[PDB]
C-alpha cells in the first residue's frame, strides 16, 4: 500500500543495510523502514523470552516494511509484507515474468506459497537482480532477529563450583593436571634406534640407566583378529595413553562441563534462542526467507512476490563437513581430546564451550564430553572409537538462531543464484557471544525463476582452497583447513560486493585459533591462567596471549608423552617447558641422531615416533607448526588447534561468483572429511587425502580465488604499519610516535617505545652468529636479552645459550625449569653418539649456542621462527583488534589512588633500559603476544605522555614487580566496545572495496586489483580528539550507532553513524557474571614474581633472559579489587574518558555523524618509492616515521592529519567527519538522494516543467497514424528527438537535448506507446552523465502510456 508515516528508515545491524540503491531501468532505493518508535522486545530482571511468544508480540507491535523510493528520493509506496496481499507474477511460455512496464507484473491472483506464514517476517536486505532490475531478493528475518540485541542474552560464564585455591576468575576451571597413578604405566615408552652408540645421553629418553637416544613410540594397532564381528578392534593405542589426568579438585575432577554454565530451565547457560531444528521446523516463521520481490514502482502492478525460499539453516548444516557433527573432536582424535581435556582446554576444532553460538545446546553442550567418540572407557583401546548413532550423539556444529541470523544478510545476486553471504553478526551478537556467518547461503533459481533451491555452504568449504599465494598480505595465516574442515572460518561479513566481476566477500573472519595453539604443560595450568581460559573457551580472546613459560615445548604430544618414567618434572626432550633456547639445532648430526632414526619409521608399522629432538619454539614457531597456518598446498592444515571465538583477522576474498552460482546444493563429503571412526584409522590417516569419487566438497576449494587480511604486506612490515595505526580510543598511534631507528631508544611526551614494531627498539643485532646463520641486521625489539660481550660495554648480537638456560651458573631456573642438560652429538663414523654436557672437541652441541636475543612478545626474528613471537596470525589479530582498539593490555597497576602506574614507573630510552630493562615494564608473560605491552599501555592510557606533559592519565599500566612483590596483573581491553563483528556494509569505490570495521573505515585499495608495493589498505578511523567522534568510539554499543558506509559520487566512503544511541548510552552510564561489555573478555590474573625479572641468581643481566616464569596462581594471587574492576572494560573506559576531559559540547550534541574517508592520493600506501642496504621492515618503519607528526593535552592525540595522504592510515579529519544533528535510524540512498531517516530534501531528477503531454495534448491521430515502431528507434528504445517535443512539455528554458524518451512498451496492434521520460543528469554537471527517469514527468511518475482511449 501507500506510505506508512509511522515507519521510518532503519539499518539492519547484521549488514549495516538500510537502503539498496537502484541505478538503471528500475531506479530509486529499497529502504528498510520500521516502527522505529516501537520498543521492540519490551526493552528501552534479565527475564528469558520465549521465542514464539516474542515473535508474536513483535508481529503485533513492531511494524516493518520495504519502502520503495523513486530515483529522486521521494518516499513511494511502502511494502509492509505483513499488511501486503501479494500475488505471484504470471509468466509467459518462455518462463520470463509477465511484466508490462505500466500494467506491472501479471498478478496470478494467488499469494506466494507459504506466504501467510511469512508475511509477518521482516525485510532486512534487498538485492536487485542484475539480470532483472525489477527482480529483488528481499531477505526476511523474524521480527525477533531485528530486536535480538534487546533480549540481552549474554553468554553465561561457568559457575565457580565458592572459594578456590587456584585463584581463577570468571568461573575458570584451572588446576595443574596431575599424573594418573593408576595410569602411570601409560607413559609413552622411548624406543631406541634399530641400528648404530650408548654414551651418556640422559637427555634423549634414557632416564638413569638406559642412557640411549629413545623416541617415544606411539603404537596404535588393530587387534590381530581381522574379522568384523565387532568391526575394527584395537589391542594397543598409545594415543589413548593418559598418564596425566584431570586433577581431583576437592574430590571432583576439575573438568570442562556444560553444567558449569548452569542448568537449562542463578547462572543460566547460554543456549541459542532457537535451535537449528527449531528454525528448520517452522521455517517460514523462524528462518530468513528470500522473497523474490518483483517491483515496478510506476506500473499499475508495482508489487509481485514470486518465491519465498526459506534459507533453511539445516540447508547449510546439511552441507556442514561431517567432522562438524563431532566438533569436540579433531583429526588428532583421542590424543588431542585427552590432552586438551586434562589441560582444562576445549577439545576438538570447534568446541561449544568456545563457540556456543553454533550449537543447538549452546552452553548446555559446552564441554569436552559427548564428542561422538569414545573418550571415557575402562579399556583405553576402546577409546577414540566413533560413537554409534544409537549411542549418545555429540552436539554438532549447527546454525542456531544467533549463528544462523549472523549468517543471514549481505545478499549478493549472480546470474540465477542469490548468495546470502551473511552479516556481521551484530543482529544476534551479545557482549560475549560471537554469532558469525559460518558460510554462504544460496538460493539458486532456475532461468525462469519459478523454482529455487536453498543451500548453504560453510565458509570452511568455500575457503578450503586458501593458500599463501592467494594473499598479497600475511603468509602462513591460520586460514588453512584440512579434509575434515577443522578450521571453521566464520565471518562478520561486510558484504559480497562486485568490483566489476570479482565477488569481494569482505569483513572480518575467525581464522584458526592460534591463541591456544601452544598447549600448556599439565602442571603449568595454574600458572598460565589466561591460556587455560583461552583453551577452555572462557577467555574468548582469540589473540595469542604471551604465557610461554608454562607451554609445553610442543602441543602435539599425546598425554603419554607428557610424563617421563623418571623423576623429571616433564618428559623432556619430548615434552617440557617451551624454551627455544633449549631447542635442538636442525643440523645434520642432530636431525640424523634424533629425527632420522625414527623419521622413516614414523607412521610405518602402526607406530609414530616423538623424536628426542628438543622441539621448542616461541609464539611464531607454535603457530607455524600447529596452527592451521596457510601453506602453498590447499587443505594442508595438519594442525587446526581450534577456531577463533570472535573474528580474529580482517578479511576480504576475491571469490569466483561463477563457481558460487554453479556450486552444488547438497554438498557430498567423502570418508576423508569424516573423522576417522577409530583411533587406528586416525593414526594411519593422511592429512591430504584425495577426494572420493562422487563427492563435490573439493569443488568449493576454487571458490576463494584470492584473499587478503587487510594490508598487502609481510608480517613485520604489517607490524610497522600497525604501530602507525592510531588506537582509536584516544587516537594515539600504537607505535606511540616511535621514530624507529631515529628514536632516542636506539643505541646512539613526544615519543615512546612502539607496540608492534621492533625497529629502533633494543639493539641492531646481527643474526649471522645467531642460530648459526643477506646479513639481516635485525632489531631485537623490546625485551632484548643480549648477552654482554667479554668487554662488558658492548652487548652481543645474540644471547649465549648458557645465559638463557642458566648453565653459566650450572637449579630451579627459568632457563632450564625441566632440568634440561646440554646435549652434544659426535659423528664417529655414522655412529651418532649423543652425550650429555657441553659440546667440547668435535662433538656438535644439540642446542643452539647463540640464540635470538629476544624471547618476549616483541620477538620478531625472520631468521629464527622458533624465537619469533610476532607471527602473521597474531599480526592479523593485532591489526583487527587495534582497529577495534580492543587489544588487551596487561596491567598490574589499576590506576586507582594506590595502584597507579606513574610516568616515572616506565622508561623508554635505551639509556635507561640498558642499565635496567625492568624500567621498560614489559611483562614478557601474560600480555598479548606480538606487541610491546608497555607500548600498548602508553598508547591506551598515556601514563608517560601525561607525566611529561602534565597527571591526567588514567594511571593504568603494567609495572615490573619490584623487590619481592608479585605482578598480579591482568589483560584488560581498554574499554573500547568495538568488536571484530563491528563490520559495516561492504561498498565498492573504483577498484577498491571498503567497509567500516569497528571505528575504522577499512579500504582494501589493492586487493581486487593488487598493486605491487602498496600498503594494501587505507584506514580511516574516528578522530578521538573530536569529542563527538570520541564518544562514538567510547560507546558501550558503538556498532549500534553505525548506519552505513556508502561510497559517494567522489569515490569516498561516507559512513553514517547514529550517535543518538551513543548519547543515550552515555546518559545511562552517567545515571547508572561477565559485564555486558562487548570486549569484556574473561581474562585471568597473570601472576609473576619479581624474581622472574631478576634472573641473575653473569654476562646477561637482562630480565627477559629467560621466559618469564609465572607463579602458581592461588587465591592469594587473585586480582586486585580495582584491577578486577578493570577487567570490566566499562571501568577502563570510565577511567580513560575521565582522562579525556569532560568538555561535552552539547551544541547541539549531534545525533548522527557522517565520516567521509579522506581523498587518498596516488601515493597513499605506496611503498614502491619506499622499498626501492635496508630491510623492507626498516624502510617501511622509517617511511611511517616520515609520516608521524614531527616534534598530553587531555590524553588524546591531536588530529594533525599527517600521513593520511601518504600512508593511507589515519583518523577522520574534522571536515571528513560531518556532525549532523538529525538522528539516523536508517539511510535511504538513491543514486541521487541521500536521506537520513528518509527526511531531507529529495533529489531533483530534472526540472518540474518538463512533463509528459496529457493524452488530450498530443493529437493521437497524426501521432498514431504511422506505426508506433516507426515513431521511435526499436533498439535504443528511445523516441526520436524529432518526436520528443510532440510527446512531452518542453519549456524553452530546458534544452530538449537534455531529455530522452525511453520507450517502455510499444504495441502496434493497439497502437499504444509507453515512454519513460528521462532527463540527462550530467556527472558533476562536458556532456557526460546518466539519462535518469524524470519522476516529475507525470503524477504517476516518469512513465506514461499513450493509448487511443
Amino acid at each position, epitope marked *: 500500500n501507500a506510505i506508512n508515516p509511522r515507519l521510518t528508515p532503519w539499518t539492519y545491524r547484521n549488514t549495516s543495510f538500510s537502503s539498496l540503491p537502484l541505478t538503471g531501468e528500475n531506479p530509486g532505493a529499497w529502504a528498510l523502514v520500521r516502527d522505529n518508535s516501537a520498543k521492540g522486545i519490551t526493552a528501552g530482571q534479565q527475564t528469558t523470552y520465549d521465542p514464539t511468544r516474542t515473535e508474536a508480540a513483535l508481529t503485533a507491535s513492531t511494524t516493518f516494511a520495504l519502502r520503495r523510493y523513486d530515483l529522486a528520493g521521494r518516499a513511494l509506496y511502502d511494502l509492509d509484507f505483513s499488511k501486503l496481499n501479494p500475488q505471484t507474477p504470471t509468466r509467459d511460455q518462455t518462463g520470463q515474468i509477465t511484466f508490462n512496464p505500466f500494467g506491472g507484473f501479471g498478478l496470478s491472483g494467488a499469494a506466494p506459497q507459504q506466504w501467510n506464514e511469512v508475511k509477518n517476517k521482516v525485510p532486512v536486505e534487498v538485492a536487485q537482480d542484475p539480470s532483472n532490475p525489477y527482480r529483488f531478493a528481499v531477505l526476511l528475518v523474524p521480527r525477533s532477529v531485528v530486536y535480538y540485541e534487546q533480549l540481552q542474552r549474554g553468554l553465561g560464564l561457568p559457575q565457580q563450583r565458592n572459594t578456590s585455591t587456584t585463584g581463577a576468575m570468571f568461573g575458570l576451571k584451572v588446576k595443574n593436571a596431575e599424573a594418573d597413578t593408576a595410569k602411570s604405566n601409560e607413559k609413552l615408552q622411548g624406543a631406541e634406534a634399530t641400528g648404530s652408540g650408548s654414551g651418556q645421553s640422559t637427555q634423549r629418553g634414557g632416564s638413569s640407566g638406559d642412557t640411549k637416544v629413545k623416541a617415544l613410540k606411539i603404537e596404535v594397532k588393530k587387534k590381530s583378529d581381522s574379522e568384523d564381528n565387532g568391526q575394527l578392534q584395537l589391542e594397543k593405542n598409545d594415543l589413548a595413553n593418559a598418564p596425566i589426568k584431570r586433577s581431583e579438585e576437592s574430590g571432583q575432577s576439575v573438568q570442562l562441563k556444560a553444567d558449569d554454565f548452569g542448568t537449562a530451565l542463578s547462572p543460566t547457560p547460554w543456549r541459542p534462542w532457537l535451535a537449528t531444528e527449531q528454525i528448520h521446523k517452522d521455517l517460514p516463521k523462524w528462518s530468513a526467507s528470500i522473497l523474490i520481490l518483483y517491483d515496478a514502482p510506476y506500473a499499475r502492478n508495482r508489487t509481485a512476490i514470486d518465491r519465498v525460499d526459506h534459507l533453511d539453516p539445516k540447508a547449510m548444516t546439511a552441507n556442514y563437513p561431517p567432522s562438524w557433527r563431532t566438533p569436540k573432536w579433531n583429526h588428532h582424535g583421542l590424543w588431542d581430546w585427552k590432552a586438551r581435556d586434562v589441560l582444562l582446554q576445549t577439545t576438538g576444532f570447534f568446541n561449544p564451550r568456545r563457540h556456543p553460538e553454533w550449537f543447538d545446546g549452546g552452553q548446555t553442550v559446552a564441554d569436552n564430553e559427548k564428542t561422538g567418540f569414545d573418550v571415557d572407557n575402562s579399556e583405553n583401546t576402546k577409546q577414540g572409537f566413533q560413537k554409534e548413532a544409537d549411542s549418545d550423539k555429540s552436539a554438532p556444529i549447527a546454525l542456531p538462531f544467533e549463528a544462523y541470523f549472523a549468517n543471514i544478510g549481505n545478499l549478493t545476486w549472480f546470474g540465477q543464484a542469490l548468495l546470502v553471504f551473511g552479516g556481521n553478526g551484530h543482529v544476534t551478537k551479545s557482549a560475549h557471544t560471537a554469532p558469525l556467518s559460518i558460510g554462504v547461503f544460496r538460493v539458486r533459481y532456475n532461468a525462469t525463476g519459478t523454482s529455487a533451491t536453498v543451500t548453504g555452504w560453510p565458509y570452511a568449504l568455500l575457503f578450503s582452497g586458501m593458500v599463501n599465494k592467494q594473499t598479497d598480505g600475511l603468509k602462513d595465516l591460520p586460514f588453512n583447513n584440512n579434509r575434515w574442515f577443522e578450521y571453521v572460518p566464520r565471518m562478520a561479513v561486510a558484504g559480497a560486493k562486485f568490483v566489476g566481476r570479482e565477488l569481494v566477500l569482505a569483513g572480518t573472519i575467525t581464522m584458526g585459533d592460534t591463541a591456544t595453539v601452544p598447549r600448556l604443560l599439565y602442571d603449568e595450568l595454574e600458572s598460565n591462567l589466561n591460556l587455560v581460559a583461552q583453551g577452555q573457551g572462557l577467555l574468548r580472546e582469540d589473540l595469542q596471549l604471551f604465557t610461554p613459560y608454562g607451554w609445553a615445548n610442543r602441543p602435539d604430544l599425546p598425554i603419554g608423552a607428557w610424563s617421563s618414567s623418571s623423576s623429571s618434572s616433564h618428559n623432556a626432550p619430548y615434552y617440557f617447558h617451551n624454551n627455544p633456547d633449549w631447542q635442538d639445532r636442525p643440523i645434520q648430526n642432530v636431525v640424523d641422531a634424533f629425527i632420522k632414526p625414527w623419521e622413516d619409521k614414523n607412521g610405518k608399522d602402526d607406530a609414530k615416533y616423538i623424536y628426542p629432538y628438543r622441539y621448542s619454539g616461541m609464539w611464531a614457531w607454535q603457530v607455524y607448526n600447529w596452527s592451521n597456518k596457510l601453506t602453498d598446498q590447499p587443505l594442508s592444515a595438519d594442525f587446526v588447534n581450534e577456531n577463533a571465538y570472535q573474528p580474529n583477522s580482517l578479511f576480504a576474498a576475491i571469490l569466483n561468483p561463477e563457481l558460487l552460482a554453479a556450486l552444488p546444493d547438497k554438498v557430498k563429503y567423502g570418508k576423508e572429511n569424516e573423522f576417522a571412526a577409530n583411533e587406528y584409522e586416525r593414526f594411519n590417516q593422511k592429512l591430504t587425502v584425495a577426494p572420493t569419487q562422487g563427492t563435490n566438497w573439493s569443488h568449493f576449494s576454487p571458490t576463494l580465488s584470492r584473499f587478503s587480511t587487510g594490508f598487502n604486506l609481510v608480517g613485520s612490515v604489517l607490524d610497522q604499519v600497525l604501530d602507525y595505526v592510531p588506537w582509536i580510543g584516544n587516537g594515539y598511534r600504537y607505535g606511540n610516535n616511535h621514530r624507529g631507528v631515529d628514536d632516542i631508544t636506539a643505541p646512539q611526551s613526544r615519543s615512546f617505545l612502539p607496540t608492534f614494531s621492533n625497529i629502533g627498539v633494543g639493539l641492531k643485532a646481527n643474526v649471522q652468529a645467531t642460530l648459526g646463520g643477506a646479513n639481516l641486521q635485525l632489531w631485537t625489539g623490546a625485551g632484548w636479552r643480549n648477552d654482554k660481550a667479554s668487554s662488558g660495554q658492548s652487548d652481543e648480537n645474540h644471547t649465549k645459550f648458557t645465559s638463557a638456560t642458566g648453565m653459566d651458573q650450572q637449579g630451579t631456573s627459568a632457563g632450564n625449569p625441566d632440568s634440561l642438560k646440554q646435549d652434544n652429538i659426535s659423528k664417529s663414523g655414522d655412529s651418532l653418539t649423543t652425550q650429555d654436557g657441553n659440546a667440547i672437541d668435535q662433538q656438535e652441541a644439540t642446542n643452539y649456542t647463540n640464540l635470538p636475543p629476544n624471547l618476549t612478545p616483541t620477538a620478531d626474528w625472520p631468521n629464527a621462527l622458533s624465537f619469533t613471537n610476532k607471527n602473521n596470525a597474531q599480526r592479523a589479530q593485532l591489526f583487527l583488534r587495534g582497529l577495534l582498539g580492543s587489544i588487551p593490555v596487561l596491567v598490574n597497576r589499576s590506576g586507582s589512588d594506590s595502584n597507579k602506574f606513574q610516568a616515572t614507573d616506565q622508561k623508554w630510552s635505551y639509556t635507561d633500559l640498558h642499565s635496567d630493562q625492568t624500567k621498560l615494564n614489559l611483562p614478557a608473560y601474560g600480555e598479548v603476544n606480538g606487541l610491546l605491552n608497555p607500548a600498548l599501555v602508553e598508547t591506551y592510557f598515556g601514563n608517560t605522555r601525561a607525566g611529561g606533559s602534565g597527571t591526567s592519565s588514567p594511571g593504568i599500566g603494567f609495572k615490573i614487580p619490584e623487590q619481592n612483590n608479585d605482578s598480579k596483573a591482568t589483560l584488560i581491553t581498554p574499554g573500547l566496545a568495538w568488536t571484530p563483528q563491528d563490520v559495516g556494509n561492504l561498498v565498492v569505490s573504483g577498484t577498491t572495496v571498503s567497509f567500516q570495521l569497528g571505528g575504522w573505515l577499512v579500504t582494501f585499495t589493492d586487493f581486487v586489483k593488487p598493486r605491487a608495493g602498496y600498503l594494501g589498505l587505507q584506514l580511516t578511523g574516528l578522530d578521538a580528539s573530536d569529542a563527538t567522534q570520541r564518544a562514538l568510539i567510547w560507546a558501550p554499543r558503538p556498532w549500534a550507532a553505525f548506519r552505513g558506509s556508502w561510497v559517494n559520487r567522489l569515490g569516498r566512503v561516507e559512513s553514517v553513524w547514529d550517535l543518538k544511541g551513543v548519547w543515550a548510552d552515555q546518559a545511562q552510564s552517567d545515571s547508572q557474571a561477565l559485564p555486558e561489555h562487548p570486549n569484556a573478555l574473561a581474562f585471568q590474573v597473570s601472576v609473576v614474581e619479581a624474581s622472574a625479572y631478576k634472573p641473575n641468581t653473569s654476562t646477561n643481566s637482562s630480565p627477559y633472559l629467560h621466559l618469564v616464569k609465572p607463579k602458581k596462581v592461588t587465591q592469594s594471587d587473585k586480582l586486585d579489587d580495582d584491577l578486577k574492576n578493570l577487567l570490566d572494560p566499562n571501568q577502563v573506559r570510565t577511567k580513560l574518558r575521565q582522562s579525556f576531559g569532560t568538555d561535552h559540547s552539547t551544541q547541539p550534541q549531534p545525533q548522527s555523524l557522517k565520516t567521509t574517508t579522506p581523498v587518498f592520493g596516488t601515493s597513499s600506501g605506496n611503498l614502491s618509492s619506499v622499498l626501492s642496504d635496508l630491510s623492507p621492515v626498516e624502510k617501511v618503519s622509517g617511511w611511517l616515521v616520515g609520516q608521524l607528526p614531527s616534534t598530553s593535552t587531555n590524553n588524546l592525540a591531536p588530529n594533525t592529519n599527517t600521513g593520511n595522504d601518504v600512508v593511507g592510515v589515519g583518523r577522520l579529519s574534522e571536515s571528513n567527519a560531518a556532525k549532523m544533528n538529525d538522528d539516523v535510524d536508517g539511510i535511504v540512498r538513491t543514486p541521487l538522494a541521500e536521506l537520513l531517516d528518509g527526511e531531507g530534501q529529495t533529489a531533483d531528477t530534472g526540472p518540474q516543467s518538463v512533463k509528459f503531454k496529457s493524452p488530450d495534448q498530443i493529437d493521437f491521430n497524426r501521432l498514431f497514424t504511422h506505426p508506433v515502431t516507426d515513431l*521511435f528507434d526499436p533498439v535504443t528504445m528511445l523516441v526520436y528527438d524529432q518526436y520528443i517535443p510532440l510527446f512531452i512539455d518542453i519549456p524553452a528554458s530546458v534544452n530538449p537535448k537534455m531529455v530522452r524518451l525511453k520507450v517502455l512498451s510499444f504495441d502496434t496492434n493497439e497502437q499504444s506507446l509507453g515512454l519513460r521520460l528521462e532527463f540527462f543528469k550530467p556527472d558533476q554537471d562536458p556532456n557526460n552523465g546518466d539519462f535518469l527517469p524524470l519522476l516529475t514527468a507525470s503524477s504517476q511518475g516518469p512513465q506514461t502510456l499513450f493509448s487511443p482511449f
Partner: antibody
Amino acid sequence: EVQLQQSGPELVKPGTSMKISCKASGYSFTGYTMNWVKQSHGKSLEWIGLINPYNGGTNYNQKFRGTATLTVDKSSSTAYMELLSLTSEDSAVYYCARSNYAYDLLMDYWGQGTSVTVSS
Amino acid sequence: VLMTQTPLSLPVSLGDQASISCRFSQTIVHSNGATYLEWYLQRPGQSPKLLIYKVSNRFSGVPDRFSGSGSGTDFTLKISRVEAEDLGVYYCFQGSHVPWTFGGGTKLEIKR
C-alpha cells in the same frame, strides 16, 4: 551489395558547422536506420547517434547530442551529420552505417569513413 | 554500461584461437530479448566491418572463423583461425543500452 559512400576527408576550422554526406545505394534508404559513429585517431569507436531516414528521426547519445546533428535527404538517399561547433576532441573518422532492425543488425555496412580534423 | 573490452591488444599468430573478451557491469540483454552485442573488425585504413551480430549470429559475407558467444555481461569472440585479413582492431559494441558504447578496441597483431 549495400553501399555507403560518405563525404571525403574534410578539413574544417573549429566552430564551423559542416555536413558529412552519406550516399546510400543498394537498398531502400528509409527502411534501415543510418547510424553515425566517431573514431578518434588511435582510440575506440564512439556511436554518435542514429537517424531513421523514413521519418528522419534522430536518437543521439548525449556525448554527441549537442555536438552533432543527424539529418537525411530521402530524395537522394543521403544521410548527413552537421557537427555543430567542432572542437579539438571532435577530430576523428566519422562513419555512417546502415542498420537492419528486422535481423537486429545494429550498423554493419559502414561507409568508407570521413576523416575530419579540426586543427585551425 | 561501463564498457570494458579485454585485451587492448591481443597477440595471436596465423591460424590460432584469438579470444577477445567483452565484459559488462550489468547484463546488456535488450528489452526485446535480442542481446545487441556485435563484434566489428576494422582493418587498418578501412571501415569497421561487422562480423558477429546479436552476440552469436554470424554476419552475412563473414567467414565461419569468427564466432561470438556469451550471455548477460560476458561476451567472447573466438576466432578459430587468424588470417591476414583478420589483422585490425576488434570492437565489441553493445546496442541494448544507450549510449551505444564500443569496446576499448582489440588490435589483432601477428605474434612474432
